[PDB]
Amino acid sequence: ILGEERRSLLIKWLKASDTPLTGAELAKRTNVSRQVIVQDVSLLKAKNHPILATAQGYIYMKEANTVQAQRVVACQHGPADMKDELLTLVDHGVLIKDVTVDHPVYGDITASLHLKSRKDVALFCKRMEESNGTLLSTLTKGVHMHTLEAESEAILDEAIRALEEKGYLLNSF
Ligand SMILES: [Zn+2]
């Protein structure tokens, strides 16, 4: 019952929140470890709760106030340009919803980044440099996809235009 009561609290907190809630925050609210929160959210996902784990924490998926434009963007940059590419997008008010790499073993690998702010980008680059961080490894030579979303198609156009200026787009060939 304690597990069921804890998971009931998680649902309530995720639905009330407008920002991602880290596993560490949820763990401290319920006096468990962050590994236990991983298991709780896994059980809730299997009961068809649209809960998403992002680089900044968990979100309960719900629809927005206004229709947000979306676009799939093919990108490619050097092994040390990732922070600059991500900062370029968030500075245009674009949500970096995910990244996808065409892996030769796993197939398409997609990570739900949900980067929105400069601090999101900085902390994500900080923690991934402090580990192996080879999702964008030597395998695809920098080639990767992004799902971007913004308030309008004109904002996406300008953000993508800024990527091309910096040479971060995959160019037709
Ligand atoms: Zn990228």
Numbering used by the authors: 7 to 179
Task: Provide the authors' original text about this structure.
The crystal structures of the niacin-responsive repressor, BhNiaR, which negatively regulates the expression of genes involved in the NAD+ synthesis pathway, were determined to be the apo and niacin-bound forms. Three highly conserved histidines (His83, His150, and His152) and a glutamate (Glu91) form a binding site for the zinc ion and niacin. BhNiaR formed a dimer between the C-terminal domains as well as between the N-terminal domain of one subunit and the C-terminal domain of the other subunit, whereas TmNiaR formed a dimer through the C-terminal domains alone.
Although the refined model contained a subunit in an asymmetric unit composed of 173 residues with a zinc ion and 129 water molecules, it could be generated to a homo-dimeric structure by a symmetric subunit. The N-terminal region (residues 1–6), the linker loop region (residues 68–74) connecting the N- and C-terminal domains, and the internal region (residues 137–147) in the C-terminal domain were poorly ordered due to lack of electron-density maps. However, in the apo structure of BhNiaR, three residues (Glu91, His150, and His152), corresponding to TmNiaR residues (Glu87, His146, and His148), and a water molecule coordinated with a zinc ion in tetrahedral geometry: Glu91 Oε1, His150 Nε1, His152 Nε2, and Wat108 O. The His83 residue was not involved directly in metal coordination, with a distance of 3.8 Å. The zinc ion is located between layered α-helices and a β-sheet of the C-terminal domain. A dimeric BhNiaR structure was generated by a crystallographic twofold symmetry.
